[PDB]
Amino acid sequence: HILDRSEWLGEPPSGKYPHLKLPVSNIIIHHTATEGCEQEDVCIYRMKTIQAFHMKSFGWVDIGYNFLVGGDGQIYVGRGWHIQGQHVNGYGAISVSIAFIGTFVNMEPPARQIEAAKRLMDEGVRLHRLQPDYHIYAHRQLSPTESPGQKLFELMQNWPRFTQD
Numbered sequence: 364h365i366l367d368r369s370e371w372l373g374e375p376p377s378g379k380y381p382h383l384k385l386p387v388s389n390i391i392i393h394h395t396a397t398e399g400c401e402q403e404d405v406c407i408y409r410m411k412t413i414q415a416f417h418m419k420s421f422g423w424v425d426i427g428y429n430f431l432v433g434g435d436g437q438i439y440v441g442r443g444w445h446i447q448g449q450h451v452n453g454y455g456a457i458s459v460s461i462a463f464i465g466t467f468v469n470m471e472p473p474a475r476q477i478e479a480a481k482r483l484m485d486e487g488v489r490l491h492r493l494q495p496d497y498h499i500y501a502h503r504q505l506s507p508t509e510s511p512g513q514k515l516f517e518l519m520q521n522w523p524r525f526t527q528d
């Protein structure tokens with residue numbers, strides 16, 4: 364279940380932003396450092412609120428992430444596959460971001476949230492958005508941040524395609 368901008372009731376982007384050359388080789392895992400969401404209506408509310416924060420507080424053209432996944436086990440489309448993402452605690456790696464909605468410092472995401480990210484990535488490969496040999500990194504490997512949270516970072520150690528280096 365993938366909710367696009369029309370389904371999470373988002374605003375259109377306020378301007379253009381550099382395109383991503385596809386397929387991309389890297390996925391970067393974030394957390395949103397907000398409350399999590401375990402049912403669609405709450406996830407949609409969170410998405411709207413995060414988009415507003417990014418657009419109004421930071422002045423960005425759109426919610427910063429390419430994709431987000433909710434504790435409801437659903438995928439939320441942010442900027443999508445074709446547009447470069449933007450992130451607090453920035454980095455320049457050519458990649459697509461997936462933000463786990465929530466804060467995973469001392470709690471883990473439910474299985475269904477992790478499974479949503481996995482499903483998103485396999486679809487990326489099928490539709491030629493992600494290279495077949497793509498690698499997965501944590502935001503904190505690339506920038507001085509806690510993101511995606513200690514507990515989620517621990518879980519990632521055993522993920523297929525997770526790259527320590």
Ligand SMILES: [Cu+2]
Pocket residue numbers: 364365366367370
């Ligand atoms: Cu949909």
